Amino acid sequence: SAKDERAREILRGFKLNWMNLRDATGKILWQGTEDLSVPGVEHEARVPKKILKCKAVSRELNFSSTEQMEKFRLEQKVYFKGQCLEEWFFEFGFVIPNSTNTWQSLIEAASQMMPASVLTGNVIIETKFFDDDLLVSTSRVRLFYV
Ligand SMILES: CC(C)Sc1nnnn1-c1ccccc1
């Protein structure tokens, strides 16, 4: 497949450098430099339980890409014990070949949150990376609320 081959070259050239989350406030809730976008292994992350109380969270996401992309975008789903509770769409747009970029997103909560003690270890965030319609990778991060 010509498309399959293109997705793999994009994946091969892609790196998530660092990321953080802030209350939208302005206060840093979490930050890391693990590439949570790597597919095929379940990532784990520890986040402050207070995040469950925020109406909105601001994410900063720094990434590099050898390959040019025309419409880089994400689809993210929150799963609780295997059931999708919420889905988010974010678009970055055009990506220059061999660039490093910082991408700011606003994540809003829809609905009433279960307590942290119930959620912890039972939430998975599934992320799909797209160039327009081309699925480049799928990764998963299990959340613990501390
Ligand atoms: C690979 C995706 C970018 S993971 C992701 N997307 N928004 N928040 N978030 C995250 C941030 C810290 C811990 C667990 C999940």
From Swiss-Prot:
One of its GO terms (cellular component) is cytosol. The keyword Zinc-finger does not apply. Its main location: cytoplasm. InterPro entries: Ig_E-set (IPR014756), PDED_dom (IPR008015), PDED_dom_sf (IPR037036), Rhodop-sen_GMP-Pdiesterase_dsu (IPR017287). Transmembrane segments: none annotated. Residues 140-146 are annotated as: Required for association with membranes. Belongs to the PDE6D/unc-119 family. Interacts with the prenylated catalytic subunits of PDE6, an oligomer composed of two catalytic chains (PDE6A and PDE6B) and two inhibitory chains (gamma); has no effect on enzyme activity but promotes the release of the prenylated enzyme from cell membrane. Interacts with prenylated GRK1 and GRK7. Interacts with prenylated Ras family members, including RAP2A and RAP2C. Interacts with prenylated RHEB and NRAS. Interacts with prenylated HRAS and KRAS. Interacts with RAB13 (prenylated form); dissociates RAB13 from membranes. Interacts with prenylated INPP5E. This is Retinal rod rhodopsin-sensitive cGMP 3',5'-cyclic phosphodiesterase subunit delta.
